[PDB]
Design an enzyme around this catalytic site. Structure first.
Site, PDB file in Angstrom:
ATOM      1  N   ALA A  79     -21.169 -56.405 -38.174  1.00  0.00           N
ATOM      2  CA  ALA A  79     -21.953 -55.188 -38.294  1.00  0.00           C
ATOM      3  C   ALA A  79     -22.714 -54.816 -37.024  1.00  0.00           C
ATOM      4  O   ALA A  79     -23.061 -55.681 -36.208  1.00  0.00           O
ATOM      5  CB  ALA A  79     -22.928 -55.339 -39.461  1.00  0.00           C
ATOM      6  N   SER A 106     -16.562 -52.801 -39.409  1.00  0.00           N
ATOM      7  CA  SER A 106     -17.608 -53.048 -40.388  1.00  0.00           C
ATOM      8  C   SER A 106     -18.056 -51.761 -41.061  1.00  0.00           C
ATOM      9  O   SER A 106     -18.139 -50.698 -40.424  1.00  0.00           O
ATOM     10  CB  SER A 106     -18.801 -53.728 -39.706  1.00  0.00           C
ATOM     11  N   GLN A 127     -13.711 -52.112 -43.450  1.00  0.00           N
ATOM     12  CA  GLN A 127     -14.419 -52.894 -44.426  1.00  0.00           C
ATOM     13  C   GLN A 127     -15.084 -51.976 -45.417  1.00  0.00           C
ATOM     14  O   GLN A 127     -15.702 -50.983 -45.049  1.00  0.00           O
ATOM     15  CB  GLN A 127     -15.423 -53.814 -43.738  1.00  0.00           C
ATOM     16  N   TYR A 129     -17.491 -51.971 -49.025  1.00  0.00           N
ATOM     17  CA  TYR A 129     -18.168 -52.499 -50.194  1.00  0.00           C
ATOM     18  C   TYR A 129     -18.018 -51.419 -51.237  1.00  0.00           C
ATOM     19  O   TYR A 129     -17.971 -50.222 -50.895  1.00  0.00           O
ATOM     20  CB  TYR A 129     -19.657 -52.698 -49.936  1.00  0.00           C
ATOM     21  N   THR A 155     -14.775 -56.221 -49.396  1.00  0.00           N
ATOM     22  CA  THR A 155     -15.688 -57.344 -49.549  1.00  0.00           C
ATOM     23  C   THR A 155     -16.278 -57.283 -50.945  1.00  0.00           C
ATOM     24  O   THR A 155     -16.712 -56.224 -51.415  1.00  0.00           O
ATOM     25  CB  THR A 155     -16.802 -57.345 -48.490  1.00  0.00           C
ATOM     26  N   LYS A 219     -11.091 -59.848 -50.157  1.00  0.00           N
ATOM     27  CA  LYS A 219     -11.719 -60.933 -49.410  1.00  0.00           C
ATOM     28  C   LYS A 219     -12.538 -61.805 -50.356  1.00  0.00           C
ATOM     29  O   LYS A 219     -13.259 -61.277 -51.193  1.00  0.00           O
ATOM     30  CB  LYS A 219     -12.650 -60.330 -48.359  1.00  0.00           C
ATOM     31  N   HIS A 243     -18.381 -68.136 -46.382  1.00  0.00           N
ATOM     32  CA  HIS A 243     -19.172 -68.793 -45.348  1.00  0.00           C
ATOM     33  C   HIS A 243     -20.166 -69.790 -45.868  1.00  0.00           C
ATOM     34  O   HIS A 243     -20.803 -70.474 -45.082  1.00  0.00           O
ATOM     35  CB  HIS A 243     -19.874 -67.761 -44.467  1.00  0.00           C
ATOM     36  N   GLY A 275     -12.736 -67.694 -41.128  1.00  0.00           N
ATOM     37  CA  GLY A 275     -13.832 -68.653 -41.171  1.00  0.00           C
ATOM     38  C   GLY A 275     -13.643 -69.822 -40.245  1.00  0.00           C
ATOM     39  O   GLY A 275     -12.817 -70.698 -40.494  1.00  0.00           O
ATOM     40  N   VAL A 277     -12.234 -70.136 -37.251  1.00  0.00           N
ATOM     41  CA  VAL A 277     -11.056 -70.350 -36.392  1.00  0.00           C
ATOM     42  C   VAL A 277     -11.482 -70.190 -34.925  1.00  0.00           C
ATOM     43  O   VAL A 277     -11.977 -69.127 -34.544  1.00  0.00           O
ATOM     44  CB  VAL A 277      -9.875 -69.418 -36.753  1.00  0.00           C
ATOM     45  N   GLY A 297     -14.410 -63.570 -36.359  1.00  0.00           N
ATOM     46  CA  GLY A 297     -15.599 -62.707 -36.352  1.00  0.00           C
ATOM     47  C   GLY A 297     -16.591 -63.055 -35.237  1.00  0.00           C
ATOM     48  O   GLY A 297     -16.705 -62.320 -34.247  1.00  0.00           O
TER      49      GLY A 297
END
Lengths: 359, 359, 359, 359
Positions: A79, A106, A127, A129, A155, A219, A243, A275, A277, A297
């Site tokens: 974000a 984002s 992304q 929501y 998400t 996700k 996460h 996550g 990588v 990310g």
């Protein structure tokens, strides 16, 4: 000076940025994430290299949702990137385009979908929501469609479940919400924090499909059960991500889940990993476990804060170079050659104990 | 200042209390217990969260022995609480009542069953040892019946199997024994220490049922075998508990036992866990393993010593809040939804190795 | 001062004795042994206690080769004990007798079999090496028979496979060899070091039985295979022992072997354990694994060096007391009640994963 | 001073040699290797010793490709040994000959095949890379044939996949390439670095057999699959080796692979291990896992740098002595007696859990 690895940008960004800005990215909105995500799990997967295969030419290109990309390595949403560097999402979009890969923008970007598109050609995901106001979802989806975006990365958590908060300065806003009909005012930032829907179910995933024809990526799937439900719900793909909440001592293993999720999906739709990588060997391990690609990310934002567009370019090139070398060492000439038999996991039955064939 | 977790009261109580008083509670009558009980075992259980389930409203209420309570979190007996704080058991009883849960009163309380009852309505259990004088048992049971207590928590060990002893000051006594016919005198404290029966068998559990109609809970069951015998002996419930003897290097795992005990009990009676529950994630893990609820002992006394009634109230509220959040993160809307498939244990067969269905 | 455990004599003996003398005992003739023997393995075995069994009276007496003894805890041979304390083997023999247990006298004792016998009644075993001169073996066996000894503890290794050597002072000798016909001279110490036979096989165990009718115990069996061969060779018992060669990085696990050896022996003859037993919980664990008793070596010599006869007496009493308590905590009223189901080992199938019965 | 173990030469060589020279050997051309190779894996294999077997005379001689040698311990190629000591490969060849074992000469030796042969009789193997110019391969093979060499050790990796480089001084060259027809010049060192073929496949192994009748050993096989392909490709033997790339976090386990490779080869051809063998117990463990012998590389160069020919002689004698002792402790009188049942691995099914026979 010389940056040699992806995780080395993490220090430069810590210096460059105000503490709260860095923590927000390193540890997420709250202080719940760990920076060492998956590093131990990845450590405990070993290689089974094949020899005497001609690997002088490695092809790592792949197709994601029908779109050809140069490597199975894509950019995750983080974000308000103008907090990290003045060029913000503009820099991320250009570097992604130049590297021939996908950027996910984002929902909370400091740059809009059309600004991102104004930078030139490139495959991008957005992304989303699901907000309480379904008409606002409608407007976001339509704006992204018009801007040429290719897929919804849905998400499904709530970032509300604090100490790592900062204010956007007056010159910066949540540009995707700017100009939209919000109906009948404590600020725009409060609106997008307050209006995330707490009641989301699979019925909402099916509802998304009545307002858009874009492929939807779900996700957060960590189990065989939700992988099956994602397929049945009409998802075009699954992102295995979580996460964790470290203060609550709430740890789920994404890595252990990755293989399970892939198997449950039965080859119907692609499975991605997001996550921790950080290495070419990580990318290889996720693909051998059956993932179709991965997202990074943190390394993108950090290298943005450290060197702008040139840093993102560099993170992508380092990951890429290590990946190629990993494939070469393994005897894999293409992504197709990265099989489950090129790694060994702690849960694998030991091959040394098995009887060898020859009847 | 700000207390954020349950285990943070442990330091404040260490300061506030004389060393021997604190050690007596932290480590038990002798120096045999560990304060780190179950912390490692709980650490090695991970979550399997489900997504896209509406968890905006979590119901954590449950029924224990027919009694509705607000949460599967109850208070364990700790002796002579007026040593820890002037209000003692009075404070524990009021906080339990206010939180809508169950308190178990120690056999060795500095406050009697009727004093506890004088504080108002509330469901309470009474800790019982079988003493050598069976008529004294009879008197204790009858006093607790008259005071409105609902169940017997039978302790079956001997606290005689030292360095952590102190004297009760003259103004404090073992109030449950006060006024009782003890028959034909070195003090009351010596009497209740000396007269614990060393010959206890299951026949004594059956004998308890001829003198009272109250449900009996048997504390200390660590094996499938004794779980079956508890059911056959007419026990109304089992408490899985054993604090260990660390100086002897005598460690039994309660956590590993919990699931085994639950399975052996065959759904006939509830199974509870007592021992080192400190986090909302601990509560969740015990229930997923099949326990019907848990008891906390140390955290209650510590928070009593630190802040009195307000501290107990706070410990219960913190445990409660973390539990709700844990359930929310797991996709569980009620206690019924906390299944064995929401956790993964080191002894679970790896799901990633299994073939996925779809015929 | 106060000695509370068996391993606490180890420091007092280090102080009291010349370095080389202490190292010789702590680490053996060479520097090959470890003092931490079995401590890790024993640590990783946990208890499965039973409750509501009357353990007010624990019987720990047992029978070894037809001889009743007070506890399954016996004394292992350690050479030249007059180096450790002026009373030497005399003190060991008296303490063993007083505790009602068995002493094994070292082949290399600074006191003879008849000196040991002169101290009074007691069941004793004699350590034997097969020497190259079979007639010398004959003389040792006959002297031990005449002195009232009950069994041969046959050591089957060579202590030749250095830095930890010392000389016996002139007033001390290898008393079991003194006066014997050795035939046709660089000292007695050199003779007994030089004349150990390097060619020993099972045929030699069978040969022993033509010269004596005493039960033979074979020390060193670490495998199912050699346990079967010991039975077939006419051995009256097996001692599972092997102190390892740490400098060579040559580690064998006796503990893992103990259960295997016991099972292979098929109940035909008793199986004993020697090596790093220091706690009452250790004794319990060895018996539950199926051993008929254990031997302690180092703790006896150390406590001899520290307090003479009174120290040995104390080591035996501490081990004994912890053992009783361990049995009490486990719900075991006699040695017969110490079953394999009272412990759990890392190689046990997890009971929590199994389905519970009730058809 | 006194050198007691093989790994103790490592410090003396660090001192004696320029940093870059030592690192080149300790860590390889790049910084990719670890010096602790296999030390952990070897640590986690334990022994199952047999007793009462006459081991006074140990035979450790064996046959390799028809050639009798004194021990299953051979010398691996390490390049340009005159950098490590003035006598270089001459010293290695003489010590190997004197110890009655095999030396493999590096393709990149500072001494030619015929120089090595000029030192006297001895069985030697020659390291080969397949170079892009097949006629150059032809010349190397023919020179080695003429010099009396017995086998090709084919290396199949590329050492190109930096910081550890040095220049050979003018008086030293890559003697195996000297005088050869190279056709139509930036130096000889650059030629042999540049002309390694990146396209090698099994077809090239089969091609080698059209230009030479020497047995070919294929180095680098880590899987059952490539072991089968090596047999089918006409390889006379397999060397299980892979030093890893530590900076890339690219770890493959050779030890776990060793047993698998041996089983896959089905007794058709010998299997050797190269990588971190330092102890007599290591040699034993590799053979019990089914290897026909092992190679040591680093310890030879280090002891060469430290003491020249006398040091190599000493490394070989120490390894040898520990090996014999290991066999003696295990109850193994010859190499044939080193069975898979003389060790236990973490992947072995626990024998203590199995039911013992006797019907």
């Amino acid at each position: 000076e010389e940056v040699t690895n992806v995780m080395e940008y993490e220090a430069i960004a810590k210096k460059k940025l105000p503490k709260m800005v860095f923590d927000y990215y390193a540890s997420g909105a709250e202080d719940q994430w760990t920076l060492a995500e998956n590093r131990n799990a990845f450590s405990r997967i070993l290689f089974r290299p094949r020899i005497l295969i001609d690997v002088s030419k490695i092809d790592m290109s792949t197709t994601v949702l029908g779109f050809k990309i140069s490597m199975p390595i894509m950019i995750a949403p983080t974000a308000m990137q103008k907090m990290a560097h003045p060029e913000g999402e503009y820099a991320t979009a250009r570097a992604a385009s130049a590297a021939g890969t996908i950027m996910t923008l984002s929902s909370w970007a400091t740059s809009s979908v059309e600004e991102v598109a104004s930078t030139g050609p490139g495959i991008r995901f957005f992304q989303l929501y699901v907000y309480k106001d379904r008409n606002v979802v409608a407007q976001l989806v339509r704006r992204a469609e018009r801007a040429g975006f290719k897929a919804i990365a849905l998400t499904v958590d709530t970032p509300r479940l604090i100490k790592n908060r900062f204010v956007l300065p007056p010159f910066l806003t949540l540009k995707n919400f700017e100009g939209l009909d919000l109906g009948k005012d404590s600020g725009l930032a409060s609106y997008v924090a307050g209006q995330i829907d707490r009641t989301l179910s699979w019925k909402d995933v099916q509802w998304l499909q009545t307002i858009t024809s874009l492929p939807i990526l779900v996700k957060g799937v960590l189990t065989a059960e939700d992988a099956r439900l994602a397929v049945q719900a009409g998802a075009a793909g699954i992102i295995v991500s979580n996460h964790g909440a470290r203060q609550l001592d709430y740890v789920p293993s994404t890595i252990m889940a990755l293989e399970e999720v892939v198997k449950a999906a039965q080859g119907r739709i692609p499975v991605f990993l997001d996550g921790g990588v950080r290495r070419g060997t990580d990318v290889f391990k996720a693909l051998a476990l059956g993932a179709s690609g991965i997202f990074i990310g943190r390394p993108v934002v950090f290298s943005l804060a450290a060197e702008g567009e040139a840093g993102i370019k560099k993170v992508l090139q380092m990951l890429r170079d290590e990946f190629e070398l990993t494939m070469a060492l393994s005897g894999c000439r293409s992504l197709n050659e990265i099989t489950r038999n090129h790694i060994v996991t702690e849960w694998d039955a030991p091959r040394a104990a098995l009887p060898a064939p020859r009847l």
